[PDB]
Amino acid sequence: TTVPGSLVWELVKKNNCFLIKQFGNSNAKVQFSKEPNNLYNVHSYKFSGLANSKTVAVQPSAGEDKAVVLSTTKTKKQNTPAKLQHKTLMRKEFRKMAKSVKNQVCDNYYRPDLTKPALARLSAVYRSLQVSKSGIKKKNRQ
Amino acid sequence: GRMFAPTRIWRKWHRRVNVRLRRVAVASALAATAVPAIVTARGHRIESVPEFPLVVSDSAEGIEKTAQAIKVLKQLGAYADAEKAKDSVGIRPGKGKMRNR
Amino acid sequence: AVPLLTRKIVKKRVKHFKRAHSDRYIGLKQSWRRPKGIDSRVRRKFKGCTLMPNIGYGSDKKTRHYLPNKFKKFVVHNVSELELLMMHNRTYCAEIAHNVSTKKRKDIVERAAQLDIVVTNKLARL
Amino acid sequence: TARPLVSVKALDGDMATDAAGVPMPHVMKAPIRPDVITFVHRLVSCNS
Amino acid sequence: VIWTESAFKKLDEVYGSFEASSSKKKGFVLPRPKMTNADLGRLINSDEVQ
Amino acid sequence: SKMALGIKRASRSHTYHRRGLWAIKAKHGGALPKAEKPAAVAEPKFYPADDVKPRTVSTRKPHPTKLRSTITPGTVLILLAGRYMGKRVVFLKQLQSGLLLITGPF
Amino acid sequence: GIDLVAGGRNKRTKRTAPKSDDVYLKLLVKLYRFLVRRTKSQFNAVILKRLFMSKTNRPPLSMRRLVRFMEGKEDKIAVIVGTITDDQRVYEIPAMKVAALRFTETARARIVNAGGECLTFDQLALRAPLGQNTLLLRGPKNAREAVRHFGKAPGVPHSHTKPYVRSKGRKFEKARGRRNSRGFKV
RNA sequence: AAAUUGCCGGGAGGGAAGCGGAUGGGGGCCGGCGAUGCGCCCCGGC
RNA sequence: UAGGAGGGCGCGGCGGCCGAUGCAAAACCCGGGGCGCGAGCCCGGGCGGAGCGGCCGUCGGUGCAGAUCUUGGUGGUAGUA
Ligand SMILES: [Mg+2]
Ligand SMILES: [Mg+2]
Ligand SMILES: [Mg+2]
Ligand SMILES: [Mg+2]
Ligand SMILES: [Mg+2]
Ligand SMILES: [Mg+2]
Ligand SMILES: [Mg+2]
Ligand SMILES: [Mg+2]
Ligand SMILES: [Mg+2]
Ligand SMILES: [Mg+2]
Ligand SMILES: [Mg+2]
């Protein structure tokens, strides 16, 4: 982002290739953004994976089990896309993995914005991997 | 019968824009490409491209074949983008698919 | 897979707003069109004539667009457009788009069952 | 007396050189302007 | 856009700078923005404003 | 005396007495005790996406239902609903949940 | 019911956000929403309410008049929510510091070579968040050529409104109603 | 496709039918139509 | 009411973006389930057997209940005169 985060937001807020909007421009409008480096996949300036210098992505990994990728952008290497993302493939237990994500997101003051959301996506991703391994045992409707 | 207000050849098919406004627009078209974030948001697959705004040596100018051109785009990170372009090709839906498009 | 909604959905009117006179004629569809007549007792709002929509019949803002599921729906065409609902499955509900193959519906529903995303079309086309 | 330096990429089968970065152009730093771009693109596209 | 070195090194000889008659194109200087630095972060968070 | 009771309860001094801030000036020397920082569990098993809200251990302590004036231990009631309607019973004692406790006798 | 005109709701209307969808000017609008909200500076409120303008409520202000308005007040920073266009009818101009939405490349060269400072509003919001030492100037609104054609009617007496005529000449609105020798003098 | 017609099953009819607001009775229909899980805790291995 | 303005729904293209499609597209039918105050929209079932959408920008031969409206079809009239 040569131009600042706010200007990239103001430039991509209305149509961006990662945005899925349905139900029209009325009060019914549903907006999600589907870029990898967005946590809640909410289209807003807090979360946006394009309008920001500092973003935290947490993805279930390519073909391999129980391995979660945590990546954060590097603030200084913005104009070098191949070398913009710091990824780490952690297969440790949940508690250790969450300690690491706090280390990388909140405790270094990288971006405390996403201290909670990144751990929420970590929870959801980790259990998605669990169930992709075991299968449905709970229905979780109660 | 007719149609109401039948179209006529002397509609305003071409519009004019100030020459300086074309120049302003093309400068602000250039200035937006030098941003990886907007090049991405515009839809291009740029995740292995080495640096923006990307530049190659002039020895690229001397090639002749498209095998060589794809060889060139492998070194850069844009052959993913060429692949997107080539695998997205399809028949234009609607009355476009019969008007020579 | 358990709804976030904690606010009972009350509707001020369930019956539809059919076009006035759609009953006597067959060419007139049921879709509402406001009577613009000058002697139209519908427009003059005599008691006993088909009610027009107002804004007063609006529904509550936090209880708007929730199916009886108590989820807001979202139409997904494929697994990629599904995996963006992991952190909303307590308020959003994925529906598979009406023109997908059953081969791809099996994939969507497979993925949804594990990501724990409520769906209303996991018994569609099978 | 300092502007950013854009690194070139050579290819395979390239002669070694003592070259440096190409300095960044100003037109690559001009304002980014979407209302003008959509205006002008609407009118330039009508012209064919 | 993928630039070759020959093109990229003559962009500035085509477009010029914030200088009269810099360009190859007569009657044009690069547009100047309505803010030199649009980082509302540093505006709203710098010492002077805060 | 509902409203006289309201004021007598509402006095600041009588609220001091009722909350019993004396005997809280007893234990911690000649002053009101400090409070501290519980909840040092630091072991969340799972992180919800929705903003989390804990279980309500309800701190509101409702009044007891008032047994009617015309009810005395020993009063012959009249049941009115359920399988023993019309049955005349004898009231033993209005128990701790609020419900009456009656007997036929059987 | 109750006795009110339009239910008492405001029938006047003002801009509350610019119609221009210029990204930099929306960013300025954000910045000054924040400044007016947290800062209470009436000057910033005025800058705001003047970002919410047209271009015909923001006429250019030229160097001749700007120098008129800053003779002898050069520890105070000029603020024009508008445009600054130069003037060859001026010869010596003070080394002067001015904030404005735009500078014509001749006006900005003029000022810079006078040795002053050519600010934008983002620079201004730093060194005058409350508008210390500032000189708020507007341009001449009723100077536009269209403004002539307004007022009471061109042909009612005691009114000097310009009529809409497709050319000045003798044959174009000079005969009856413009002289006693044909009819009457307006 | 619709207006229009035939058969099959059902519904109702003291000089119109149709429509709006109430529910009541019939049908036709919905399992994201409606749950079975959470903590502690003891093994027995994973 | 006449009238005005704002925000939206819908149709057919064009420049881009996201995709669906012989495991069944478009179109059409339903006592199917919904969403919206509303234009409308989403899903299910069926026939159907080859193409189609959604979003941003932009455009136009774009929204029907009337015009003794145009064309085509079909009723009662009527198994009657
Ligand atoms: Mg014809
Ligand atoms: Mg009347
Ligand atoms: Mg009232
Ligand atoms: Mg006179
Ligand atoms: Mg029919
Ligand atoms: Mg019958
Ligand atoms: Mg009725
Ligand atoms: Mg009923
Ligand atoms: Mg027409
Ligand atoms: Mg056409
Ligand atoms: Mg009609």
DSSP string, D7-18: PPB--SS-----
Report the gap between the CA of B5 and the closest CA in chain E (Å).
43
Q: How far apart are CA A58 and CA C17, in angstroms?
A: 47
| Cβ-contact D47, B14 below 8 angstroms | yes
Please say whether the beta carbons of A138 and A60 come within 8 A.
no
Of the listed ligands, the closest to the CA of C23 is 7
* Chain D neighbors of A11, CB-CB under 8 A: 32, 34
Contact C78, C108 (CB under 8 A): yes
Strand residue runs (E) in G127-183: 134-137
DSSP H/E element including D38 = helix D34-45
Integer CA distances (angstroms), C101 to C82, C85, C105, C110, D39, in order: 15, 21, 6, 14, 41
What phi, psi does E31 have (nearest 5°)? -65, 140
Per the CB < 8 A criterion, the answer to whether G133 and G41 are in contact is no
- Angle of CA points G88, G93, G99, to nearest 5°: 95
| B24 SS3 class | helix
Residue with tokens 């985060």: A5
Distance between CA G158 and CA G155 in Å, rounded? 9
Q: Does C107 appear as a known binding residue?
A: no
The helix/strand/coil state of A89 is: strand
- Do B76 and B56 meet the contact criterion of CB atoms below 8 Å apart? yes
Which amino acid appears at position B33 of this protein?
Answer: T
Segment holding B75, helix H or strand E: helix B66-75
Question: The tokens of B13 are what?
Answer: 């098919």
Strands (E), chain F: 90-91, 102-103
Q: Which residues is G78 bridged to in the sheet?
A: G98, G135
Specify the 3-state DSSP secondary structure of F5. helix
- Residue G97 dihedral angles phi and psi, to the nearest 5°: -115, 120
The span from the CA of A120 to the CA of D28, in Å, is 40
Cβ–Cβ contacts within 10 Å for residue G184, how many?
A: 11
Distance CA D5, CA D21 (A): 5
- F touches C (3+ CB pairs < 8 Å)? yes
How long a stretch of residues is chain D?
48
User: DSSP assignment of G18-40, as one string?
Assistant: -S---HHHHHHHHHHHHHHHHH-
Cβ–Cβ gap B57/D6 under 8 Å:
no
Question: Which residues have a Cβ under 8 Å from the Cβ of C23 and sit 6 or more positions away?
Answer: none
CB under 8 A, 24+ apart: contacts of C61-64:
C62/C7, C63/C5, C63/C7, C63/C8, C63/C9, C63/C10, C64/A27
E35 touches chain G (CB under 8 A): yes
Q: Which residues does C39 contact at the CB level (< 8 Å), separation at least 6?
A: none
What does the alpha-carbon distance between residue G44 and residue G40 come to, in Å, rounded to a whole number? 8
Q: Which of A116, A125, A64 has its CA nearest to residue A94? A: A125
Question: What SS3 state is found at A5?
Answer: helix
A-chain residues near F45 (CB < 8 A): 94
> What separation in angstroms does the CA of C119 have from each of C2, C115, C116, G138?
12, 11, 9, 60
Taking CA atoms, B10 is separated from A67, B6, B14, D43, in Å, by 66, 12, 10, 17
Q: How remote is the CA of residue B9 from the centroid of ligand 1, in Å?
A: 17
- Pick the residue from chain G with its C-alpha nearest to E18: G105
Q: Residue B58 in contact with residue D10, Cβ under 8 Å?
A: no
Rounded to the nearest 10 degrees, the angle between the axes of helix A5-12 and helix G23-39 is: 120
Yes or no: say if B24 and E31 are a contact pair by the CB < 8 Å rule.
Answer: yes
Beta bridge partners of A49: none
How far is Cα E38 from Cα G172, in angstroms, rounded to an integer? 54
Distance between CA atoms of residues B56 and B71, nearest Å: 13
As a rounded value in angstroms, the CA-to-C1' distance for C5 and H32 is 14
Encoded tokens for E9: 């090194």
- The alpha carbon dihedral of A38, A41, A47, A51 has a sign of positive
Number of helices and strands in chain G (H, E): 6, 5
Q: Which amino acid is at A85?
A: Q
Question: CA G94, G98, G100, G103 torsion: positive or negative?
Answer: positive
The encoded tokens of residue C45 equal 């709002």
Joined tokens for residue B12: 């305003």
Across all strands, nucleotide nearest C27 (CA–C1') = I65
Pick from C70, C85, C90: nearest CA to C115: C85
The 8-class DSSP code of residue D37 comes to: H
State the ligand closest to the CA atom of C43.
2
Question: Which residue, chain included where needed, has tokens 């945590």?
Answer: A70
Residue F101's nearest CA partner among F81, F71, F80 is: F71
* Interchain proximity G120–E36, CB inside 8 Å: yes
Residue D11 class from Cβ within 10 Å (0-12 exposed, 13-18 middle, 19+ buried)? middle
**Ligand that comes closest to the CA of residue B4:** 9
Give the neighbours of chain G: at least 3 Cβ pairs within 8 Å: A, D, E
As a whole number of angstroms, the distance between CA G134 and CA G123 comes to 13
Question: Taking the CB of residue E25, how many other CB atoms lie within 10 A of it?
Answer: 13
Instruction: Classify residue G125 as exposed, middle or buried by CB count within 10 Å of its CB (0-12, 13-18, 19+).
Output: buried
Best G83, G108, G126, G132 residue to mutate vs chain E (most E CBs within 10 Å): G126
The Cα angle at residue A122 between residues A121 and A123, in degrees rounded to 5: 90
- Residue pair C26/C38 in contact by the 8 Å Cβ criterion: no
Q: How far apart are CA G2 and CA G25, in angstroms?
A: 43
Total residues belonging to chain E: 50
Q: Alpha-carbon distance A71 to A35, whole Å?
A: 13
Could you tell me the two tokens for A105? 């997101």
HSE-up of B14 (CA within 13 Å, CB side)?
4
Q: Is E37 in Cβ contact with A5 (below 8 Å)?
A: no
Across all strands, nucleotide nearest C93 (CA–C1'): H32
C1 Cβ contact list (under 8 Å, min separation 6): A139, A140, A141, C89, C90, C116, C117, C118
- Parallel/antiparallel/unpaired status of strands E3-4 and B55-56: parallel
Interface test with D, best of A1, A2, A6, A80 (most D CBs within 10 A): A2
Cβ contact G161:G99 at 8 Å: no
**Long-range contact set of residues C73-79: C-beta below 8 Å, sequence gap at least 24:** C73/C120, C74/A22, C74/A30, C74/A32, C75/A22, C76/C108, C78/C104, C78/C107, C78/C108, C79/C104, C79/C107, C79/C108, C79/C111
CB A43 within 8 A of CB A33: yes
Rounded Cα gap, residues G70 and G113, in angstroms: 17
What letters, b where the CB count within 10 A reaches 16 and e where it falls short, cover C34-67? ebeeeeeebeeeeeeeeeeeeeeeeeeeeeeebe
**Experimental method of this PDB entry:** cryo-EM
In 3D space, the residue among D27, G94, G100 whose CA is nearest the CA of residue E19 turns out to be D27
Please classify residue E15 by burial: count the beta carbons closer than 10 Å to its beta carbon, then call 0-12 exposed, 13-18 middle and 19+ buried.
buried
β-bridge pairing A68-73 and A85-90? antiparallel
> Around A122, how many Cα atoms within 13 Å sit in the side-chain half-sphere?
30
Query: Phi/psi class of residue E21: alpha, beta or left (left: φ > 0; alpha: ψ in -120 to 50)?
Result: left
Residue G80 near residue G61 (C-beta atoms within 8 A): yes
Return all residues near G157 (Cβ < 8 A) that are at least 6 apart. Answer: G186
Distance CA D36, CA D47 (A): 17
